[PDB]
C-alpha cells in the first residue's frame, strides 16, 4: 500500500504554464526544475491521464489511478535509462501519437486508455541489463525463461509485475471494466508489452505492414492489436523523434546504462558487444546514426506510409537529428 504523504506529494503538483500534451514537451527540464523529480514524473502521468478524460470513462477513480502510478514507480530502479522517467516519457509520447498524430481514429477509446496504462508498466523492474545478459550468465530470470520456453526474459517479467499491481483492487485501473472489456484490457496490455522485445522488431513490423496491404478493419481484432503493438514499439524507439537537445540527453542515458552492462560482462568473463564497451570508445553520434539507419528511420517511414499518415513529423525529426549527429562527427 501507499502512504498518504507519498500520494499528497504527487497530488499537489500542477502544470498550468507547461503543456504536457505537446510534441515539444521536455521531461529533462521538468525533472531538472524541481527538487522532487520522481513526484513531478508521477504527476505528469497522473495529470496527463486525468486531463484526457479516459480513466473517468472506464470507471477508474482518481485514487486508483494515483495508487497505480505510485505502485508502478516503486518497481522502477535507479538505472541511467530504464528508470521511471523512461516509462513516463513513453506514456507522454504515445499520447502525442494518439491525439496529435490522429492515431486515436484507428483505435477504440478503451484501447487508447489501455495503451497509456501499458506504457507505464512496459519496463517494470528493469535492472539496466538486456535479455541477452540473463541468458549468457544463466541468471535465475534467464533460467526461468529457458525452462518455461518464453525467450523474452524481461518482457514476461514486466507482464508478471503488471498483473501483480493490477491484482490489488486499490490499484486496479481496469477494475471498473467487465466481461469482454476487461479481458481485452489485460490481453492487449500483455500483447503490447511482449511486442517490445527488440529481438522481435522485424517480426512485429512485417506482421503489421502485411495486414495493412488491405483496407484497415477496426472490426478485426488483429488489425487493432497490431496497431497497439506498433504504437507501443514506436513510443519505445521514439527518443530519435524528439528535439536534438532532448534526443541527445536520452542518447547519453542509454550509453551509460549500456556501458555499465558491458563492465559487468567484463567482470563475469562473458562476451561483450562493441556497443556495451566503456573503456574502448565509440562516438555517441556513430551509435545514434547506426540506430536511426538500420532501425528507427525504416520503422517510422514504413508505418507512416502504410497507414499512420498523421505521424509524418516522426520521420522528419529523426532525419533532422541524423543530420545533426553527422555534423557532431
Ligand atoms: O547511441 C548509442 N550509444 C550506445 C547505443 N547507441 C545507439 C542505440 O540507441 C538507443 C537504443 C535503444 C534501445 N536499444 N535496444 C536495441 C535495439 C536494436 C538495435 C541495437 C541496440 C539495442 C533495445 O532493445 C532497447 C529496449 C527496447 C527498445 C529500444 C531500446 C533505446 C534508445 C537509444 O538511444 C536514445 C536516443 O535516441
Ligand atoms: Mg523493455
Ligand atoms: Zn522501454
UniProtKB/TrEMBL annotation:
<feature type="binding site">
    <location>
        <position position="236"/>
    </location>
    <ligand>
        <name>Zn(2+)</name>
    </ligand>
</feature>
<feature type="binding site">
    <location>
        <position position="123"/>
    </location>
    <ligand>
        <name>Zn(2+) 2</name>
    </ligand>
</feature>
<feature type="binding site">
    <location>
        <position position="122"/>
    </location>
    <ligand>
        <name>Zn(2+)</name>
    </ligand>
</feature>
<feature type="binding site">
    <location>
        <position position="236"/>
    </location>
    <ligand>
        <name>AMP</name>
    </ligand>
</feature>
<comment type="similarity">
    <text>Belongs to the cyclic nucleotide phosphodiesterase family.</text>
</comment>
<feature type="binding site">
    <location>
        <position position="288"/>
    </location>
    <ligand>
        <name>AMP</name>
    </ligand>
</feature>
<feature type="binding site">
    <location>
        <position position="123"/>
    </location>
    <ligand>
        <name>AMP</name>
    </ligand>
</feature>
<protein>
    <recommendedName>
        <fullName>Phosphodiesterase</fullName>
    </recommendedName>
</protein>
<feature type="binding site">
    <location>
        <position position="86"/>
    </location>
    <ligand>
        <name>Zn(2+) 1</name>
    </ligand>
</feature>
<feature type="binding site">
    <location>
        <position position="123"/>
    </location>
    <ligand>
        <name>Zn(2+) 1</name>
    </ligand>
</feature>
<feature type="domain" description="PDEase">
    <location>
        <begin position="3"/>
        <end position="329"/>
    </location>
</feature>
<feature type="binding site">
    <location>
        <position position="122"/>
    </location>
    <ligand>
        <name>Zn(2+) 1</name>
    </ligand>
</feature>
<feature type="binding site">
    <location>
        <position position="236"/>
    </location>
    <ligand>
        <name>Zn(2+) 1</name>
    </ligand>
</feature>
<feature type="active site" description="Proton donor">
    <location>
        <position position="82"/>
    </location>
</feature>
<feature type="binding site">
    <location>
        <position position="123"/>
    </location>
    <ligand>
        <name>Mg(2+)</name>
    </ligand>
</feature>
<feature type="binding site">
    <location>
        <begin position="82"/>
        <end position="86"/>
    </location>
    <ligand>
        <name>AMP</name>
    </ligand>
</feature>
<feature type="binding site">
    <location>
        <position position="86"/>
    </location>
    <ligand>
        <name>Zn(2+)</name>
    </ligand>
</feature>
<feature type="binding site">
    <location>
        <position position="123"/>
    </location>
    <ligand>
        <name>Zn(2+)</name>
    </ligand>
</feature>
Amino acid at each position: 500500500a501507499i502512504t498518504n504523504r507519498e500520494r499528497e506529494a504527487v497530488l499537489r503538483i500542477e502544470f498550468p504554464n507547461v503543456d504536457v500534451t505537446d510534441i515539444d514537451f521536455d521531461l529533462f527540464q521538468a525533472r531538472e526544475s524541481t527538487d522532487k523529480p520522481l513526484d513531478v514524473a508521477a504527476a505528469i502521468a497522473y495529470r496527463l491521464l486525468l486531463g484526457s478524460g479516459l480513466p473517468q470513462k472506464f470507471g477508474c477513480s482518481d485514487e486508483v489511478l494515483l495508487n497505480f502510478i505510485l505502485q508502478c514507480r516503486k518497481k522502477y530502479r535507479n538505472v541511467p535509462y530504464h528508470n521511471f522517467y523512461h516509462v513516463v516519457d513513453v506514456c507522454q509520447t504515445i499520447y502525442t501519437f494518439l491525439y496529435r498524430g490522429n492515431v486515436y481514429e484507428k483505435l477504440t477509446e478503451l484501447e487508447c486508455f489501455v495503451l497509456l496504462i501499458t506504457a507505464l508498466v512496459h519496463d517494470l523492474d528493469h535492472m539496466g541489463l538486456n535479455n541477452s545478459f540473463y541468458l549468457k550468465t544463466e541468471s535465475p530470470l534467464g533460467i526461468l525463461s529457458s525452462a518455461s520456453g518464453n525467450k523474452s526474459v524481461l518482457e514476461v517479467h514486466h507482464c508478471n509485475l503488471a498483473v501483480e499491481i493490477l491484482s490489488d483492487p486499490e490499484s486496479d485501473v481496469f477494475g471498473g471494466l467487465e466481461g469482454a472489456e476487461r479481458t481485452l484490457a489485460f490481453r492487449s496490455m500483455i500483447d503490447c508489452v511482449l511486442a517490445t522485445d527488440m529481438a522481435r522488431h522485424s517480426e512485429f513490423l512485417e506482421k503489421y505492414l502485411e495486414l495493412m496491404k488491405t483496407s484497415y478493419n477496426v472490426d478485426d481484432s488483429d488489425h487493432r492489436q497490431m496497431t497497439m503493438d506498433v504504437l507501443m514499439k514506436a513510443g519505445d524507439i521514439s527518443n530519435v523523434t524528439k528535439p536534438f537537445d532532448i534526443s541527445r540527453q536520452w542518447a547519453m542515458a542509454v550509453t551509460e546504462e549500456f556501458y555499465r552492462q558491458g563492465d559487468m560482462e567484463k567482470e563475469r568473463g562473458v562476451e561483450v558487444l562493441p556497443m556495451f564497451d566503456r573503456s574502448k570508445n565509440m562516438e555517441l553520434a556513430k551509435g545514434q546514426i547506426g540506430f536511426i539507419d538500420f532501425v528507427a528511420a525504416p520503422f517510422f517511414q514504413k508505418i507512416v506510409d502504410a497507414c499512420l499518415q498523421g505521424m509524418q513529423w516522426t520521420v522528419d525529426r529523426t532525419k533532422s537529428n541524423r543530420a545533426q549527429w553527422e555534423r557532431v562527427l
